[PDB]
Symmetry: C3
Subunit: 148 residues, 3 copies
Amino acid sequence: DKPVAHVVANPQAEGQLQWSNRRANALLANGVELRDNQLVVPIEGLFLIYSQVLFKGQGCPSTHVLLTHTISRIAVSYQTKVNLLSAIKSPCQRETPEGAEAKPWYEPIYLGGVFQLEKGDRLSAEINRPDYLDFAESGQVYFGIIAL
Amino acid sequence: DKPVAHVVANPQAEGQLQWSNRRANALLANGVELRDNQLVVPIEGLFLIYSQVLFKGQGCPSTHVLLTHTISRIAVSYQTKVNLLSAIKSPCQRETPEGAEAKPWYEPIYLGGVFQLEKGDRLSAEINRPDYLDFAESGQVYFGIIAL
Amino acid sequence: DKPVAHVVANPQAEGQLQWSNRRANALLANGVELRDNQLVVPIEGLFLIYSQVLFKGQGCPSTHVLLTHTISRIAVSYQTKVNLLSAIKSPCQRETPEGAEAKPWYEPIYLGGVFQLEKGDRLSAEINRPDYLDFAESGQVYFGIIAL
């Protein structure tokens, strides 16, 4: 009877993090809505909120890239946006003047925490570079919430 | 009264990820069974499932290595296996022709999510290279589940 | 009615990991106490415990550094300390004799698990180098617990 959601990246969405519950082993029950790529809370309460993203690259080309993942809360019904959880990662410290190269790298980021939410609040799980995501398979990219 | 399990790597198992509840601060209660290195669910319901693995290496020898960690579900009572959560990590982008070397590196991977399971389902937390694991101590390698 | 806490790093504490509940989107309710920078459990029970730390550096200066994060339990009322969850990470495999340099790097560590605690137990989330932390913003550094 608890509101719950476990949504995954839609692998047909090219260059975007599009969440989807249309998968076996994914959930969107008891009031939680997926609207505008956001999770809308059905009741006020304490919620465990979490998400994982997986980035992938092929070597460290010429310069440098920071990868971010954040879960924001947008309170009320069109109020402000505020970050609840956030992480940053840098895949390449270096890779310069020729030689050999071109080795793929993978980098997972996990975020998870317990928060007091009000009915109607909207949650967003967002990354800066959707073009570096890897949802080539599995339980590699996901976002969920469960009322506690 | 909720089914629950928090098992750790058995440090006496050389080159294998062998789960064990025989530790203070580990749990295996209310129906959850550890059978064939797998966690068997006692009732249908929503479960928070999670696991951490820690890999360790001593420099980046000649070529390259990918480290994987996945939690699969094997539904029913001898049905198919399917991945619920998965992560990949690459420890070495490089390390070639002589010089100095040989610095140990550590890499943790965390997986966690909420899933609807049926009684009898079996859960596996698996890695590709058990020879790179580090459970030299602590709460470094663990796998748990708790009915929500 | 469940004991719960979600505390964040206090950004005014220079070179120390000082936890604080004095933030919107932070919690310290139903009996959980923040005493001596530790979370004191109000009742015996199963608790989901978790924490994230984010380290940041500016290149890989001359030698090497290991970053640790651990959550310990200190049972009873002045008994022993024991690690429940722990992770290690090494930011620099290399960076030697001149050239160019000086690129900032970020490294997040996440810990989370379910544990049977007794009333009065104290929990500590600790790092080895508080001088490498980054709580420059957001939900970057946090420690929470919720009775299950």
